[PDB]
Amino acid sequence: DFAESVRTRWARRLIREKVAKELNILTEGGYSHDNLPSDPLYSSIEEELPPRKVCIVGAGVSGLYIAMILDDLKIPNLTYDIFESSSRTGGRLYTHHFTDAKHDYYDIGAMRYPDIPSMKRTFNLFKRTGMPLIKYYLDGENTPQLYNNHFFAKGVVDPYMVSVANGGTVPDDVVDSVGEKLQQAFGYYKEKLAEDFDKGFDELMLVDDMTTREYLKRGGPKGEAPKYDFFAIQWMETQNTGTNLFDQAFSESVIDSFDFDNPTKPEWYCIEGGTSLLVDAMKETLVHKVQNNKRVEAISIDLDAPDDGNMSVKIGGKDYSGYSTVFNTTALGCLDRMDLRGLNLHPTQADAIRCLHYDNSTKVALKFSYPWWIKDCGITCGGAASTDLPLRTCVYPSYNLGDTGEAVLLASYTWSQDATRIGSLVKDAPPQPPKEDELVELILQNLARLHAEHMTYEKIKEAYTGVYHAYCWANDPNVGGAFALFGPGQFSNLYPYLMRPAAGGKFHIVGEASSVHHAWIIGSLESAYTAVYQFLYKYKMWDYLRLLLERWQYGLQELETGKHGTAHLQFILGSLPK
Amino acid sequence: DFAESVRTRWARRLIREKVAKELNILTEGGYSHDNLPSDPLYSSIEEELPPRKVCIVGAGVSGLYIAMILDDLKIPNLTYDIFESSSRTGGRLYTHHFTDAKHDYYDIGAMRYPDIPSMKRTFNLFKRTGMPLIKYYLDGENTPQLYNNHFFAKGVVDPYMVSVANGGTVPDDVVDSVGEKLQQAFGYYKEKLAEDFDKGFDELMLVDDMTTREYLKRGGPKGEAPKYDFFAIQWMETQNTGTNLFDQAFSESVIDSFDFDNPTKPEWYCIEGGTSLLVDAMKETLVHKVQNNKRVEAISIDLDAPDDGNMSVKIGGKDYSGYSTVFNTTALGCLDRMDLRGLNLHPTQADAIRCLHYDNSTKVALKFSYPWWIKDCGITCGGAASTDLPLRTCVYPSYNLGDTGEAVLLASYTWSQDATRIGSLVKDAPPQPPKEDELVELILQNLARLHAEHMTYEKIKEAYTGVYHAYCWANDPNVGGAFALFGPGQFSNLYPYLMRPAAGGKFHIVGEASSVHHAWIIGSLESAYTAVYQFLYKYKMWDYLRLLLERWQYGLQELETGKHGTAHLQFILGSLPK
Ligand SMILES: Cc1cc2nc3c(=O)[nH]c(=O)nc-3n(C[C@H](O)[C@H](O)[C@H](O)COP(=O)(O)OP(=O)(O)OC[C@H]3O[C@@H](n4cnc5c(N)ncnc54)[C@H](O)[C@@H]3O)c2cc1C
Ligand SMILES: Cc1cc2nc3c(=O)[nH]c(=O)nc-3n(C[C@H](O)[C@H](O)[C@H](O)COP(=O)(O)OP(=O)(O)OC[C@H]3O[C@@H](n4cnc5c(N)ncnc54)[C@H](O)[C@@H]3O)c2cc1C
């Protein structure tokens, strides 16, 4: 199908555009994106295998997935070490259990999974590990929305009183039509790519250098779409709770708008018991256990040594040597902090590591002695409230809908500058119990205003147990943010360098930022699968490369392999010294 | 002079553009930016004064400056309370003294002051308080610069080996000409404003909606300037250590490029003993002492009460009432966290508080048993090193140049995402002494690479005393960042609302973000002076308004007062209910 295909087609052609220019710089030529050299090695795709050992840096889901794939392939004489800087395994899969009562938790990192075709690799991993899935209610019943201290009202013009007609500055033609105006903006590029991808791709490249706000202000790479003034775009943004969208490349956002075009009523799932169940199941399966409290501070390769096992990492000032390949799966801010001089990375790959932008995210969960949002507010089916108050979005759990006693509320979920603001009130040294601090006081005050239709402040404060937990990902030194979120031009210009091997094809930058499915578990898993592919190719393990394709190829393959592919060319360009 | 005047002319006309549109919405008209109504009250500019009390929220430099002005005017029966949330007074004026030896400190907030005409109000405050000024060396001797693990070399083409000619991606025509290409970009708009401000202002408004990166990519609001590709702009950015410039409105950045056109060799000053000397001197002068540990959580006005003293604030759940005016001087993230429903602010003024962006900044200072950068590296005169390593910029103090024993180095000074990254390693619970943590280890490793021409890692580690301190402003709940840094369209569209009084002309949003001189002490001081002006006008204290103009008017006046002015019109539009 087309809507399922556009993102993979987009990624593959970005790689082709850059390979052609780089190829041309190698010989300089007539190489074009749709005319590149074929793979001279496809003619060919126990312990005749020499002993090899590989290093996996990081035990988040992508490092654990690499280990799971290697374990399943059972390559003779192949072993690995996996080093994790934190005392905790899982990375951005992170459930906080207040106690280990059934539902007494919240997820600090990933928590919901939509059932769309690009997520097949993710749901297969859930299947392999026996994850108990339940429905996640993205849209709920009776959730309040509060802006300009007015509640949303069905079938009312400008209920928040923010439009020019009511004395504000939001244009009357935008105030009640945000979702609609956004779906056109992109929708003009949806039908051009649908007519024919090659012509649509070229038209979309003229906005690849644009932010969302820039597109909406200028009306097209060509100027053929409606134009919006400052306050209209500000409102479209204010109504955007969630990850930053208006600072993303407009091209990327157009690609994103196909994601839910089977259409945007897929069901959503979460893991009963918390997403960390997945981590536990993965890490208990591994042949070689994760080594926690092992922060890599340097990675190198010794080009004077001709053997396969010529790479090393440094941990706590000690050298760990003998690796034939290193898979780095950390977020890029962590990788930028390492001493990578021993890898001789080319400058533009070094820039991608340093410059790609990460969005912040903060979560605040509070425990109440009963679920007053269910019992008193009629909020019986999950969903989320949104507001311009500091807590921005209050998420009603989908895993405790039938409980009648103590219950967790995800009272604030913020992104970007809102998350930095709440994060300033979050300390990893909790106050002396049961002192209430500034953050709790703020959240309770905001919750009472958001639920003022059915609750008082006194009644919410009375229901609060005194137990809460909060977490700000930009303040976690092992991650530095929620996830990559690429500015104008960054994806078209840097994704080719991030997907590329380095150090003679022996080093891989792996993880959600290295994939076009970035932001989600699927991006981590696909990037891991791709790195294992290139590793097997590097050492010409053709029998095991076939097994990888037969056993672990899910959904549409991001990496363009085969005969017309570019995988061999990304490998060569990453294997090239200088 | 023109170059001294452009920023004030720019600000005043932005106010006029918005007043004309709003005026027109009031009667709807023929009001234009250069045809607005005159002041009907200039015909007129002890205890015939009724007793009044005002509230100053925040004891940073702008709240202390308001109190200092009021103290000097000696208005009979006028008193004030000034409430400060922190246990510390000073705000973003913040010297950390490791001990109180002479030079044993670093400044966490403001530290250097250029002697340019727009800074006259600041140097007058230094004069009034007896500040001991010494030279601040912005450019030093022999400071290293390290990019792509190459050191800068005089008279060498592409010393960092990042250009297309040397296998990188930075265009050969940009790699060694960044400062030059930037000075043209703006320079095309410098000479249009110089020809005639009205025509230049209109041409500049066509880019007011643009970021710096957007301008450089598109080459002009008109497309008449050179255009730059992604990697050229990335490099111009990489070479930008300092506050974000490429995400500012291009208009604003053009205005900024006049700042140092007397020209850009003014001298710089710092305060010997730390900038907190200024705080101490100001706070010890006040008639009413700062009340610390008093965080305002709500501000209101009681419109049912006709008396002047009808405003209140809430602090720790207790009401403090009786105020005739409230000056809020906190950063806007703090003000957005308050319950301001009692003020009935109009939605667009509420949006400005919530949406204006703040840049992050982090500083890391280490003490060494001797100044090895002076003695061993020849870095004898201050300045700063720059690098693409995580510490980004290392600032050699200007206040310890003659010392031979223990000395402080400001080893890392970062902004934006670099500051968020270092900030993730900064905890306000210091590690158990004298354990070395991840941050110190990183800074020492980076310092040794930056100074590798004359130092070893072992020699720098040996000189380190084990004493350091670090601070990340985005993680301070009393501030939330270094300072406002306005995106595309934000200054033109929101500065008019921030300068405007509210609540019947009785509430003022004061501080560095409320001024066109924003980012600096001068912006805080000018915004404070402006708020006192509007307060005196509100209560028709014409004798004291004259004294304010005679005693406290320094430099060019930001606020357009007089007969053609707009001050009375900003007051009316802020006094209007609904
Ligand atoms: C707030 C939030 C909400 C999310 N919600 C969803 C969701 O609902 N659905 C979804 O599908 N995805 C979601 N995601 C995305 C998903 O969680 C991530 O894409 C994925 O978990 C990232 O995994 P990774 O292995 O690529 O990286 P990581 O999880 O970051 O793992 C990298 C590991 O490397 C370790 N490390 C770092 N430095 C070093 C070092 N020097 N030495 C050794 N180890 C090191 C880190 O400690 C970490 O364990 C969310 C993410 C966030 C932040
Ligand atoms: C890293 C950095 C470097 C700088 N360098 C320079 C420089 O070299 N030169 C220069 O001229 N300027 C510099 N500045 C800018 C200058 O420091 C600021 O412009 C100025 O100090 C801001 O003062 P203010 O009074 O506007 O705000 P603030 O200093 O933020 O003061 C506001 C006060 O309000 C308090 N407060 C907050 N919330 C509440 C509440 N709810 N109730 C009561 N009180 C509250 C805060 O604690 C604070 O004390 C720098 C700033 C930073 C961050």
Ligand SMILES: N[C@@H](CCCC[NH3+])C(=O)O
């Ligand atoms: N995947 C994450 C983040 C999505 C928002 C990205 N800007 C979630 O489900 O919340």
Ligand SMILES: N[C@@H](CCCC[NH3+])C(=O)O
């Ligand atoms: N005024 C501050 C910040 C300037 C950079 C602004 N982006 C200083 O001297 O460092």
